Structures are given as structure tokens and as C-alpha cells.
Structure 1
Amino acid sequence: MFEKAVVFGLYSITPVHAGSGAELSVIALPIQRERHTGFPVIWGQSLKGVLRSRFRQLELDEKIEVESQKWKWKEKTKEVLKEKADEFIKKVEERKRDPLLTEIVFGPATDEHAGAVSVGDAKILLFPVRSAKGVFAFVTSPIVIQRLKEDFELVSEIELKQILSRFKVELSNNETIAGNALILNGENKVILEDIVLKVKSDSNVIENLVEVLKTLFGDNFFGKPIESIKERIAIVSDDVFKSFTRFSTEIVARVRIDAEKGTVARGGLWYEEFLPSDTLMYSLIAVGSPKKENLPKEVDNTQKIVNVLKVTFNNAFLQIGGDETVGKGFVKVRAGV
């Protein structure tokens, strides 16, 4: 199964609060965090639930143009199913089912077969921390590069394969490797939100990381110049990076006000935690050949079923988490071409 795979990228335009956690240490609703590492994460189960719904609503509006040809789902099901396809049309319009093409891609609805694709967990790749010079910095960890090193080998692999093995850096708890826009002038040191870091001299690690990003997310970087990003990577130690993700996220106090008195209601006060904006996530999308059920001629093999997913989702803007109405969740996606 899952003959090939494609790489997705995410970039929080607005702070994201997706899911919760079984820890519940201080904040009432923390964000989904990995167990062994403690990094913030977007589970593939919840990430699929917004990927599929966005794909579904496109079918009702017929904007899934395949091979530069618009898709018309009403006739396609009749063309490939017939007989009860008219009843299939009624069931889909009854909200008891889902459009045909999506169920080949994202699996059947609650009411057979399986989806041709699998949605992996969205592992963090860049985290924003307030700095002294270079107002905010994109911080990573050496093992985060290691995680990206193995996963990226599934799609790209050959020049990037050779440079992928070059990602091997050991960092102490205070040294760092940072871009020019973050290093304090004269005093070769970097300050990242109350923590003083010493810059370690290097000329490959930061360049290599931004090299694979361009080759996997295009020359443009989510609406910003790529060169303006290369000066703001600050690779820190694992303990420093782990500590940042636990404490540098936005904890937002919230309360409900009753108009009868104008004050707050008793017990209606809690704190919720949000992933910061400008957080470059990435999730591996595994795609396989769909189950043969008289599918249309455009979705036979895996290479055709991945192009539709990549094209329809590149430069998209979907909402994750449970705070859509208050402007939380919008993320720009860049599929890896």
C-alpha cells in the first residue's frame, strides 16, 4: 500500500488552537503535543478532517479541475455507476453521503473500500521566538532536522539526497547557529526571549536547511521572499528548543461577560493556549492506488490521484482547530511539487 507520498507544508497566518491534551498541567486546554518529545503537533486524524471537508465543499461547487479540465461530479457518478447513481446523487444531496471523487481520495463517509491517501501527523519545522535584533526568529533543533532528513527522502529520492546526509550538527545547551539578522553586532551572541545564546560559526547547516525548503516549497516562501527567511534561522539545543515550545506559546485568558451586571460571571474564567503564528509545520501525505470500483478514467493510477490533491491544495487557506469564529486557524498550505 501507499506506493508514493507527497510532502505538505503549513504556515499559521493566525494563532492555531487545535485539539487538546491528556496532560492538562496548567492551561485548561493545551495544544496537541507529542509524548516522547513534547513538541507541538497536528494529529493526522484531525488534519485529515479539515483536508477532506475542504475537498468536499469544492465538489459541491465543482472547482477540482483535473488536468486543466473542470470536474463535474453530478455527471461523473452517473457515467461510472449508472443504475442507482441517480439515487447516489440524491443521497449525497441528502447529506447522508459524500461526493464520489472525494470518497476515492479521502475515503467513504460514515455510511466498501478505503481512501487512497493517508494523512500523516504535522510535525513542527520552524518556531517563532521573540528576539532582540531580528524581532522574531525561526528556531529549530538538530533532531528536528534529523526528523525532516528521513521523511524528505521518501519523495525527493538526487542532489538533495546527498545534501540530506550532510545534516549532522552537535550543539551545546548555550551555543547556537543563527542568521546574520539575529546576531548582535560586535558581541557575537544571540538573545532569544530572555535567553543569551552564543553563535557557533558554520556555513552549511543553515544554508542546507533553506536549500531543501526551496526545493520542496518553491522559490517563494508562503508569500515572503526566501532570502528574507534565510537570515532568521536560529538553531538551538534540544533542551532549549523543547523548553521554548512549552513556554513560548501564547496562553490567552478568556472570560464571559453577562450584560445584566456588566461584570464577569462566577466560574466563567479559563486559560487556553494557542500555537504562535509564523509556525512552519509540515505533514507527510501518503498516497496509494485507489480501490478499483469502476473509477473515472482520470483517477486510475496513483500519479494521477496525487496531482489533483497537490494542485487543489497548493496555496490554499483552510482553518484548523476550534476557534474559527475568532480568527484562529487559517493556515497557508504549500504542497511539495
Structure 2
Amino acid sequence: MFEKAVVFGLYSITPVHAGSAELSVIALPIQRERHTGFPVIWGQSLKGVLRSRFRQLELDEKIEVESQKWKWKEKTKEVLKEKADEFIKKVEERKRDPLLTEIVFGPATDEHAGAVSVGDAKILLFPVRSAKGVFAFVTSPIVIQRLKEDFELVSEIELKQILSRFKVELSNNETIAGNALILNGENKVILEDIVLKVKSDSNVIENLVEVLKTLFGDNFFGKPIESIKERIAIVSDDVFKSFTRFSTEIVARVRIDAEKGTVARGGLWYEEFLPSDTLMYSLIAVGSPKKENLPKEVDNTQKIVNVLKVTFNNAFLQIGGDETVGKGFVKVRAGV
């Protein structure tokens, strides 16, 4: 199963608070890993939000396939007939879903299986405060290793071969960074009250931005990728873990009663939010579509992955809770 796979980028426009588990300080700690402690999004939540977006798009009928609009109302009768019109009532009764979502993003609550499995969103660039170069995208060598291991399964052509050259070792008090972050005169850079000596190297950042722009385009989520290169830093594993654990946005919130104009008793709590401008990557595994008299337009796996990439490229979607206060909006750029 799962003949093909695709890579989905995710850029956090606004802080994201996905899910909720030690919760030592934050009453609602972010969706976090266990072995490494990096921020992450469970495949279940990403699959849910993607399938909700697909269902809403199917209702709105803006899922143009091969530069041709996809009308599901005629398609369900064409492929099912008999009770298909009655099946339409099930969509009208909200007890089911349109056939495209049922055959791609999993079945309904009640036989079959989804054509795509949504993996976890692994972190790729973490924004941290810098003394110079106001904020910097920091990574870790094992982050690059995970990226390479994940990306060996899709691209392979020459990009996969050249990506194997990424192999670095960093001490707990050393880093490699661009010209913007390194302080003038002194050969050290300060991020989040941590001082690191710059290690002389001019290949790892170049290759990282090279592959990033290679399968994400020159336009790095609405910004020129060249400007990003000057503000890329790679730190040690422990340093990256500490950054991803303690550099998130801890925001204290309260509830005020209009009767007295003060904070309600027991209404103060701290919520942890994943920082904005955070690059994350997810793997979507697509297999052979379920044999249910599928149209020849998406008969093969290549067609369905193509239509998914086309309909989800440069998209905007909300993840996690706190949607009503402008939290969770991210931009997705499918890897072509």
C-alpha cells in the first residue's frame, strides 16, 4: 500500500496552539514529541483539518481537476446511481460526506479506508530572538537528518543524491549562521540569552536553502528565499531542544466579569503557543484509490496526488484551538 507520497510545507502566519502532557507550567502545553521534545502536530489533527477543508471545498464546488471544475453532484450519480440521489440526502443530512472526501480523506463515521494517510508535522525552522538580525530560523543537525530520511522517499532525482552531503557535527556552544546574525567585531552570536561561537563553514546553509527553494519554489511563502539565507542558524541538539522547549509563547489569559470589573476568581491561566514564522513539514502517503468505480480522471495514484497538490498549494487553513482569537492560521505550499 501507499505507492506514492507527497511533502506539505506549513508556515505559521499567526501563533498556533494545537492540542494539549506533563503541563508543568502551561495549563495547555503545545502538541509536543516525547523522545526529542520538538514541537509537532499529530497526524490525526492535521488529517482532520485537511479533510474538513476538503469537505467544505466539495460543498463549495471549487475543486477543479485538470483545469476543469469538479461537480460532485453529477459524479456521485454517475459512479453510484440507484440510491446515489438518496445518498445526496445523507450529505444534506450531514450524516455522511461528499464522495471525494470519502474516497480520499477517509470514510465517514460508519468497509473501506482512506486513500491518503496524513503523517506528523515535524518542525524544520524555529524562530528565536537574536541580538542582531532580529529573529533567526534555527535548526539542528538531526533535524536535517530527519529531513533527508523523509525526503529520500519522494524526490528520488539528483536532488536526493546531492542532499546526502548534509552531515555536520556541532558542540553544545558552537553554531553556524549567516552574516546577519553574527555580531559585528566579536565572532559570536546571542540567541535567547545564549551565546554561541560561529563555526566557519559555507556549505550546509547553502545546501539547506538550495533544497528548500528546489522543492518549495523561489518564493519562500511570500518572501524571497535569498533573504532567508542570511538569517539561518544551526545549533547543537541540546541547544535546539532547550530553544523549542522554552522559546515558545507563554501567554497569560484571564476572564473579567462586568459586574465588578475585575478578574474572575480562578479565571487566570497560562497557554503555550507555537511561535509564528515557523516552518514545518508533513508527509502525506497516498496509495491505490479504492475500487468503487472511480472516474478515469483520478483513476491512478499519480492523478490523485496531482489533484491534491494542485488543490492544496498556496492554501490557508487554521489548525488547533483558539481559532476565534486569530490563532492557528498557516499557509501550505505543496512540494512540486
Asked if these proteins are the same fold (TM beyond 0.5), I'd say: yes
Could you report, residue by residue, the CA deviation over 1:190-237 in whole angstroms, capped at 9, with x for unpaired residues? 111211111101111000111110111111100000101011111000
- Paired residues in the alignment total 336
Q: Is the 8 A contact 1:43 1:120 kept in 2?
A: yes
Superposed displacement of residue 165, structure 1: 1.2
Distance in 2 between the 1:159 and 1:101 partners? 35
Q: Is the 8 A contact 1:14 1:277 kept in 2?
A: yes
Distance in 2 between the 1:34 and 1:163 partners? 29
* 1:132 alignment partner, SS class: coil
Identify the range of structure 1 (152-161 vs 49-58) with the bigger mean alpha-carbon deviation: 152-161
CA RMSD of aligned residues (A): 0.7
* 2:244 alignment partner, SS class: helix
Identify the range of structure 1 (289-298 vs 267-276) with the bigger mean alpha-carbon deviation: 289-298
Distance in 2 between the 1:198 and 1:162 partners? 31
Superposed displacement of residue 162, structure 1: 2.0
- Does residue 123 in structure 1 map to residue 122 in structure 2? yes
Superposed displacement of residue 112, structure 1: 2.1
1:90 alignment counterpart: 89
Any runs of at least 4 consecutive aligned residues in structure 1 with deviations exceeding 2 A, and if so which?
A: none
Identify the range of structure 1 (270-279 vs 163-172) with the bigger mean alpha-carbon deviation: 163-172
Superposed displacement of residue 316, structure 1: 0.5
Superposed displacement of residue 299, structure 1: 1.6
Superposed displacement of residue 111, structure 1: 2.4
Distance in 1 between the 2:87 and 2:293 partners? 15
Could you report, residue by residue, the CA deviation over 1:138-190 in whole angstroms, capped at 9, with x for unpaired residues? 00000000000100111111221222211110000111000111111221111
Q: How does 1:148-227 map to 2 (within 5 A)?
A: 148-227=147-226
Superposed displacement of residue 264, structure 1: 0.8
Q: Is the 8 A contact 1:96 1:111 kept in 2?
A: no
Distance in 2 between the 1:327 and 1:161 partners? 38
* 1:32 alignment partner, SS class: coil
Q: How does 1:222-301 map to 2 (within 5 A)?
A: 222-301=221-300
Could you report, residue by residue, the CA deviation over 1:209-268 in whole angstroms, capped at 9, with x for unpaired residues? 111101111111000001010111110000000000110000000110000000011111
Could you report, residue by residue, the CA deviation over 1:24-58 in whole angstroms, capped at 9, with x for unpaired residues? 11110000111100000011110001000001100
* 2:102 alignment partner, SS class: helix
Q: Is the 8 A contact 1:167 1:208 kept in 2?
A: yes
Q: Is the 8 A contact 1:128 1:138 kept in 2?
A: yes
Could you report, residue by residue, the CA deviation over 1:253-302 in whole angstroms, capped at 9, with x for unpaired residues? 01100000000111111100000000000001111111101112212110
Unmatched 5+ residue regions in structure 2?
A: none
2:323 alignment counterpart: 324
Superposed displacement of residue 315, structure 1: 0.6
* 1:272 alignment partner, SS class: strand
Superposed displacement of residue 107, structure 1: 1.2
Amino-acid identity (%)? 100
Could you report, residue by residue, the CA deviation over 1:308-334 in whole angstroms, capped at 9, with x for unpaired residues? 111111111000011100000000001
* 2:23 alignment partner, SS class: coil
Could you report, residue by residue, the CA deviation over 1:1-34 in whole angstroms, capped at 9, with x for unpaired residues? 00010000000000000001x2111110000111
Could you report, residue by residue, the CA deviation over 1:76-124 in whole angstroms, capped at 9, with x for unpaired residues? 0001100000111111111000001111110111122111101000000
Distance in 2 between the 1:87 and 1:104 partners? 18
* 1:256 alignment partner, SS class: coil
Distance in 1 between the 2:34 and 2:155 partners? 29
2:9 alignment counterpart: 9
Distance in 2 between the 1:217 and 1:51 partners? 20
Unmatched 5+ residue regions in structure 1?
A: none
Distance in 2 between the 1:264 and 1:105 partners? 47
Q: Is the 8 A contact 1:129 1:138 kept in 2?
A: yes
Identify the range of structure 1 (71-80 vs 293-302) with the bigger mean alpha-carbon deviation: 293-302
Q: Is the 8 A contact 1:127 1:138 kept in 2?
A: yes
Distance in 1 between the 2:162 and 2:73 partners? 48
* 2:24 alignment partner, SS class: coil
